[PDB]
Amino acid sequence: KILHRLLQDS
Amino acid sequence: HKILHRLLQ
């Protein structure tokens, strides 16, 4: 899921 | 002419 990864950056 | 018009009187 895209929202999953973008929140998980850094 | 809706029923709500009548009941509110």
Added chain:
Amino acid sequence: NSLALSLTADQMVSALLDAEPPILYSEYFSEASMMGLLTNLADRELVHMINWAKRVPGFVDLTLHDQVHLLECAWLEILMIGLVWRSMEHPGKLLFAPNLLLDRNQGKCVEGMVEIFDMLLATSSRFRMMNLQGEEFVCLKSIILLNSGVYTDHIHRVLDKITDTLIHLMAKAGLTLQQQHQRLAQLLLILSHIRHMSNKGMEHLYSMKNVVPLSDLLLEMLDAHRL
């Protein structure tokens, strides 16, 4: 000028408590059976709700058209907050009627209803978990009626008065200044979720119009949400 604004908070409360509709009974589980009992129940509650709204301070002052608009916008919200209120004493359950207790398992009998049930159960639990008083409930339900449709100055002034009434009640309960506006905020944020439950529940009513024959008044109440 409005008679609503001249009232004090105690008699504003007294007016709301006295205008309270009665708790109706259901008839003494499948899809049609479930929708059948609820449609009938909700239909009889609407007639009481209409006469209840007429006894809400400031509502008569509005034009007949505005009264129709507000009722059309808030009718499901008002039924839902009435449901979660009486469902407090029964955690995990929904007191639709004194002789009609529905748990989550019966919400699955109707497509798209079980998830709305959960939101209703969580709303009732939230009201339970913070000791919602009846004087607060009648203030909240009145706010929903006046705030629903309102974005189409008098209503705002009545809404401010209901706000004063809520603080007036929390001041009676012995809450500090910080606790008063904190609790005030907590109650109003819940109204946002009742709006959410209504909208999500209203579109399902469209996908249910067939199953059981809906009454004329009901059809007109939900048809208004399609314009």
Added chain:
Amino acid sequence: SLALSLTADQMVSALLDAEPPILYSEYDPTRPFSEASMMGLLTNLADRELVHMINWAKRVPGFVDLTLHDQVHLLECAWLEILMIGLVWRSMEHPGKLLFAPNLLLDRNQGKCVEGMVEIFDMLLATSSRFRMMNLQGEEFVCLKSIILLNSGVYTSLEEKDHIHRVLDKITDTLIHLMAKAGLTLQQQHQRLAQLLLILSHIRHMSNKGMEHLYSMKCKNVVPLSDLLLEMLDAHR
């Protein structure tokens, strides 16, 4: 953790520094406009705003303490509300107009270019108008937007909701703090607080109504939508 130890002034300070930028559209006032044209412009604009919203939500005191699954849920529930309140905020200076972007000003008329959009516009216009007649402050706006983020999905093992409630109470205290500085009496503070929170109920309504129309449109495939926006939208259906 950090969120609860913050005072009102440095809560405001945190929210103001965390503000996302105002993005530009790819609107060319030399082309023709249409249904797929507007929907294409708004889709691309909102898709870029979503990326900023995600990194904005991370800087909202408290959001980070939450599990990732809870952060996903909250954003999936409130993404349109946050976009809308941002829209009606920057549209305050332009009565009867909606400032989607500094180079994109639509009135009620151009809303009719898309089906079912003109009704939502009027609600957005009315909401923006309400903020105008109420003199909404930037410090108040960033409080409301943060409230929407933490409140949208709270009701929808882990009583992380209890932590969320604590942060919400902190933002409430912050709002009251701001109104006290503005010289408002105690009665005026509670009334204004109530007036603001009641508008949140309208933003919920506008979002839910717009989410249903944003689904009519996906089905059409008249105009495609980004993979993220589809996943945000699919969380509602």
